[PDB]
Design a protein around this nucleic acid. Structure first.
Ligand SMILES: Nc1ncnc2c1ncn2[C@@H]1O[C@H](COP(=O)(O)OP(=O)(O)O)[C@@H](O)[C@H]1O
Ligand SMILES: [Mg+2]
Ligand SMILES: [Mg+2]
Ligand SMILES: [Mg+2]
Lengths: 178, 228, 294, 320, 305, 319, 228
DNA sequence: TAGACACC
DNA sequence: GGTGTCTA
């Protein structure tokens, strides 16, 4: 591009050939299945009783547990996995549910910022800090405190919130609508 | 405003005490470690002409050194910092004051309990040796009619029994015993010569190093003993 | 005393000193007793009834001793956080020579178990400079060797004398802030009907002005529906120990004699296994269905 | 005269920490077994484990070193991650006792779960330098120390004295509390309140000196406070009577009364229900109470869990 | 029969060189000649799953038979750093002459390797024109879905009763020739076909046992517990418990793993309640050795398979 | 004399560490299998694994080397991260010695979980220079050594002797403890206290010499000290007898006696009730005791929780 | 004792062979890699006046370089090391001899099997190139009547078939074939010129580099082959 | 400095 | 989830 009649060179060639590894690294990353699609992929197997394995997959004991608890027919097994579920292999806790719940069919970040924000300013727990968001959003509407306390957003502070570009998106969001 | 090579020298040092700084129009700069264990203050030859908080002071100073000395720092149209060079213009962010830690006021230092001095190359040996011997705490105390500094490695020696290093500052006139313990982590002073002013009232204590360029007050540790 | 800038009444009116707090007879005197010595030992302040404002007493004892005070949300006190900030704080002698006091609020959060054990050697490590004040809803969430280095002080059972006198204190205080905040007093039985409505929890009653009944659940169990129950469960996850008590209490009267023998097996068994159960919110859901059925 | 006052300390359970092994209040054998060590001058690898806090573990560790004039490295066990063991502890075990002083590493509160790897690394390390440097480990819960490590150590276990030893320690602790009051300007009105402290929380000699500090608020001490101290550990009659009457209102109300000490109460209960009930109901009263006791500490609300016991008992207990 | 001399283990030292010398089922053998004739090797994943069938052996020989320039890399070894440096180096580093470049990546189904897998799917888009990839797997699910796209995955195993008959024969005859070079003696020729039967699938397993027995230069694991639970006896279990007291967290993991396959579907739901409850209360339990005994009995009672 | 003395050591379980393979107390076969090795002069790749500490693993490793006049590199297995294996261990397996001394690397306590990669790196490395240098691994838990490694080694497993072997070793250990007392100036009043140490903690010969150090406080083993050794792991007879008699008064009273160490007691109990009771009652005694043990530490009152066990047992146990 | 800048130069080098050292009173210092694969010995101009074991020799040397040259090292009152400066005193720990690996004695080197020499700048190219080509093993062998060194990368080439580097030391008179393999990781000699003495008996082998400042013996790997 | 792995 | 360790 600046050489007209170049050949083709897909995303992957350009990466690997030039040796910037962030593109290669991102080139690897793009191929992998979307987290949300995996979480859906799994829940349906237990349910509709179809094949799949994990360990090729991201697994939240919570998610399956929660998502499952939805149908009162599942609830007995969700319980056992609840009391007992600790220290079972993510893989085991998978196979319990599999041969356990018989039939089938099936059908915060931003707030965390606000909250861990509020507790740090007033030196209080994450418990009142919920009640503090409440007492404001209703009353006083609290963009007005979101105004004083936009002040402390420091870059270091973002890392305790979340681990990714999702954080610097927030950086601005709160520099914004108040 | 413009900043001389001496001022930025000073400022880089303060940056080691605290990553940010709050600069206020006048000829006086000061900072304190976030943890309040070390405080620095200096008069400067340049005049700071506007209030500004800088979040990464080390980064700011690096940029400065990339411009001519005549480069004119001013307040930006939108409020941030504007470094203006002959042909070039740089923009550095002003920080919300509520995000950067500053001392309230310069509290006068109490008249000294003890007074001595430390020579520039002795303070250097102490710092340097300190990384090598792994001396993480030092004690300004009295031995044989002289003021000495004793280094100890507190991880390996809890009581400060085994003395890895000793430096002799000068003879001591008074009759008082004082064992003033300091945390190496808090000796941030830029290299040079320092009047050393020790002060204590009961469990309270502080040491003020008074140099040509600046002053440093630094807290003495809990274990400190004395009859002052 | 006001902090005339701050944005929240409980925060703007927080009693600065130890008298200005609304408390039990035996309790105020015990606390006076402590600050009297001008130096604070290691303390566990434990509730368990909420909104009695543990962290307020604490923030106070520190003020009466004129101590430099580091605050930590208990949720936030993690192993490494104790290793640097606290140790950074705990270690240094203060230029002004007050006592450094670490207040750790609500240390009965969960995986903090390990930071608790790190602290056993610590507390003995800096005794002169430092003390810790732990704030717990349930003591059994403070590990026993920590309980041992600490004064366990255990809050309040207002005497009937306390009751009345506290009550007058809560009216003349609440009166005083509606003053400063320029809010209108239309009736003086509406003030005192707040001081009564939620009594031992004042932090609560002031949070009402800055704007429970088990009925919602009791009603959903009769209706035997899930959507409502499933939703109500996470609401009470917070204090299960309290809620489960209130539940057995009001279901006992409202249900058949044969169902009383069963409601106890169900709730007893559930209560019994809480703390084993991974997800407490779900474990509560499991109770609700079990109950609506039988 | 004798008693050790650190004097840089207000906290008082620590102002009064024993500096030597004699000043230590311990069982007869463990005291001699420690006296034995200090005489020889060379300390073996020891584990001092409670579990219950307050029994003298970390005091004895420091004392053993004092008494031997050891060159001692005291260390927070939680801070011994493996890198710390490889670096500073190794750098120390290895270095050459020159002052001619035996080197001891005291690793305090070393019973953490995830220090398992630092622990496995010590098992080689403890043998390698055993010529030069010995290790004293302090722990509340010994299972958190790996077997290979217990195996390399003499395991002395605190806080389970023989009734004969238990008695002698409670005599010496009382005597101590006295000598401590003397130096703190605390007046002792009744001596009964001082022995009640010693008995009340016995294994633990920290809380024991802790409660005493607590009460000198208006210093000296009276008998009036004695009623504060002993409390009421008597008469199960109210409950025993309500279980016969098989009613709930009474039981429901009595439960929160005893929530405080369940471990004590449940013991007293099985004791007196055993005699007052039928032989067949004895086999059942044990299944019921045993099962209940067993699950206390799992149970969220202890007050309710106690309620659940009472009903269960009124139902199945049949008796005159 | 080929020998790589200077090799210690017979399984390394006798390594069928050509897709012909490999002992294989009907379709499987025809399949690889099918491939070796076209003189070029596509992107492949051979997966067994039952071990010792000859994955890594067919892989290496496919290179041979086409006279490849081969780069042989084991999967535990093919790392975020290796894929970028040597692998890329070889692909883009030029061999003159004929030889075709093929990168045999062995046992690439391994837990932490999934990033090294993605990085290669992209690699394949990058370098495929100038080389070709053969990955080897015990469990294909150890492989990301996208490598299972641009790779032809041929599945080993399951010889027909005809093939069984005729493969046995080849491993028996092939066992004679090893023993001829080795100076090992065959006392009974029915005892050699006792081993070709006993573990039939497993062609790699048969050769380690053979080394074991030549001690006198002639021919004649959770298993211990798994076996004692079937036998439902106590003396054995009671004794095995203290053995594993050491790492319970590891052992209990391995146990649920292998009992899951070996037991009935209804018993799976139960084995989890039993083991889950046990694991759950470890660390409460005073005596961990006994607490483990308590598990074993509980399991022998309720498990059936 | 008849006992090696490291003499730079006060710690005494280590002052007395056997220098050779004969001085080692081991099962009959493993001693001959080790004798066999040292005679030939070239040592194979061995794993010596306990699990239970104190059985001779790291003593035997050092002895094999002594006896062969090996050029030995002793190495803390925890320190073997992969870089150390590529570096210094390779540098050594490769080097040509020349004193004409067989090279042996002893990797002590090599059973760590995360040294898994250093382990995979040895499986190539062990074959490559097996001509030049042999590796002796010591471990408490063998599953922490990868299969491919076990497979490259002779795995000799310590601490499970035959009853015939167990007897001979306890005779030799007693004999040893004696010879060690002789040299330490410890007077032996009753010999019963010395055999009680050997039996009390048997598999482990470290604690066994450790307990002995413990008891010389008064430099005598008199019957007054023999009284001590009986008590710690002592007779469960009083309870075993009260369970047969199925009475409560006795059981109720015996419970608080053993509240102290429940973890030890419950172990001794299951041990002796197993033999003395019916086969059907064995399956039950485990459910009962297992369930009890399992919930100890949840249980408020441990003394009562123990009472609850006793009744439960007297009811369901038959013999 | 006092240590000249040359001695500490040498000592820093030995420190690369083994992290500790055992120094004995006399003019002779020596060390050996813990794994026994490389041995160094040197006569020094300064006289060592007391036996001492040093656990971290690199650390010790760093400290030295922070004092004047006249700084007088002596035995400490309590036995550790005392480095005494004009105004300052440092204390470094003596190590338990049982924790530091030392060679037993200096065994005489057998009369050489082969003798050649290597020039200071050739030894330097070899080392330097070695990092760049990734040559981890070298072979001193015979080709065309000359002694050459051939580098190989043993990870990518197991047999030492492909030769990445070759250096020609000097012609070879004898008729013997010898292929002497050396592990790069074991060439620790300080840069300079070295008489090179190769020696082998059967499977045994070692190479002694003999320099002006010191000597280094280093093991030939098991795969070395010869006619000796 | 992350992610993989392992143990609460 | 937290903490630790190791390899990258
Ligand atoms: N199908 C086979 N034909 C011939 N030899 C085999 C076969 N399978 C395994 N072997 C023996 O095992 C060795 C390695 O086999 P490999 O193919 O790695 O086993 P796996 O199936 O587990 O990958 C070979 O050198 C060979 O002697
Ligand atoms: Mg302690
Ligand atoms: Mg293979
Ligand atoms: Mg060992």
């Amino acid at each position: 591009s600046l050489f007209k009649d170049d050949i083709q060179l897909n995303e992957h060639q350009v990466a690997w050939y030039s040796k910037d590894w962030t593109a290669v690294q991102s080139a690897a990353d793009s191929f992998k299945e979307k987290a949300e699609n995996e979480f859906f992929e799994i829940i349906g197997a237990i349910n509709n009783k179809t094949k799949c394995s994990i360990a090729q997959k991201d697994y939240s004991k919570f998610m399956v547990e929660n998502a499952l608890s939805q149908f009162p027919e599942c609830m007995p097994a969700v319980y056992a996995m609840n009391l007992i579920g600790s220290g079972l292999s993510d893989e085991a806790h998978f196979n319990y549910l599999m041969a356990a719940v018989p039939r089938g069919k099936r059908y915060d970040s931003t707030e965390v910022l606000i909250i861990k924000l509020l507790a740090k300013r007033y030196q209080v727990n994450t418990n009142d800090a919920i009640n503090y968001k409440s007492i404001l959003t209703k009353n006083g509407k609290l963009p007005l405190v979101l105004k004083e306390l936009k002040g402390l957003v420091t870059d270091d502070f973002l890392k305790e919130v979340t681990k990714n570009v999702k954080e610097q998106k927030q950086l601005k969001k709160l520099a914004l609508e108040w | 405003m413009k900043l001389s090579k001496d001022t930025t020298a000073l400022l880089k040092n303060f940056a080691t005490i605290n990553s940010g700084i709050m600069l206020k129009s006048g000829q006086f700069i000061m900072t304190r470690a976030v943890n309040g264990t070390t405080y620095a203050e200096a008069n400067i030859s340049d005049v700071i002409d506007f209030d500004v908080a800088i979040y990464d002071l080390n980064g700011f100073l690096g940029i400065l050194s990339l411009v001519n000395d005549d480069a004119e720092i001013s307040q930006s149209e939108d409020g941030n910092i504007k470094i203006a060079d002959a042909r070039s213009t740089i923009f550095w962010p002003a920080a919300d004051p509520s995000t950067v830690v500053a001392p309230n006021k310069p509290i006068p230092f109490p008249v000294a309990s003890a007074v001595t001095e430390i020579k520039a190359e002795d303070l250097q040996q102490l710092l340097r040796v300190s990384r090598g011997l792994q001396i993480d705490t030092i004690a300004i105390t009295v031995k044989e009619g002289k003021i000495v500094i004793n280094g100890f490695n507190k991880v390996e020696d809890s009581a400060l029994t085994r003395v890895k290093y000793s430096l002799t500052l000068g003879d001591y006139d008074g009759e008082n015993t004082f064992n003033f313990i300091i945390n190496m982590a808090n000796m941030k002073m830029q290299p040079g010569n320092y009047k050393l002013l020790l002060w204590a009232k009961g469990k309270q204590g502080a040491a003020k190093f008074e140099g040509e360029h600046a002053n440093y007050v630094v807290a003495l540790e809990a274990d400190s003993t004395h009859d002052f | 005393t006001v902090n005339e800038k701050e944005h929240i009444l409980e925060q703007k009116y927080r009693p600065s000193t130890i008298d200005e707090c609304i408390l039990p007879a035996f309790d105020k005197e015990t606390f006076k007793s402590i600050t009297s010595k001008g130096k604070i030992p290691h303390i566990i302040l434990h509730s368990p009834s909420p909104g009695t404002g543990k962290t307020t007493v604490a923030k106070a004892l520190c003020h009466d001793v004129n101590a430099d005070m580091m605050f930590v949300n208990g949720s936030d006190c993690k192993i490494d956080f104790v290793r640097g900030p606290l140790t950074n704080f705990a270690s240094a002698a203060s230029f002004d020579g007050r006592q450094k006091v670490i207040v750790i609020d609500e240390f009965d959060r969960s995986g903090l178990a390990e930071s608790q054990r790190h602290l056993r050697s610590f507390m003995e490590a800096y005794s002169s400079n430092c003390s810790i004040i732990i704030t717990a809803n349930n003591i059994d969430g403070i590990i026993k060797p920590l309980q041992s280095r600490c004064r366990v002080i255990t809050f309040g059972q207002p005497t009937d004398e306390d009751k009345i006198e506290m009550m007058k204190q809560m009216i003349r205080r609440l009166t005083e802030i509606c003053k400063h905040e320029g809010i209108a007093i239309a009736d003086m039985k509406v003030v005192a009907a707040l001081v009564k409505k939620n009594f031992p929890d004042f932090r609560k009653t002031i949070g009402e002005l800055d704007s429970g009944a088990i009925d919602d659940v009791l009603e959903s169990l009769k209706n035997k529906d899930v959507k409502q129950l499933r939703a109500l469960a996470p609401k009470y996850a917070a204090d299960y120990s309290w809620f489960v008590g209130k539940l057995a209490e009001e279901i006992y009267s409202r249900v058949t004699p044969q169902s009383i023998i069963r409601m106890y097996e169900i709730v007893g068994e559930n209560n019994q296994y809480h703390g084993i159960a991974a997800n407490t919110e779900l474990h509560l859901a499991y109770l609700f269905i079990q109950l609506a059925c039988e």
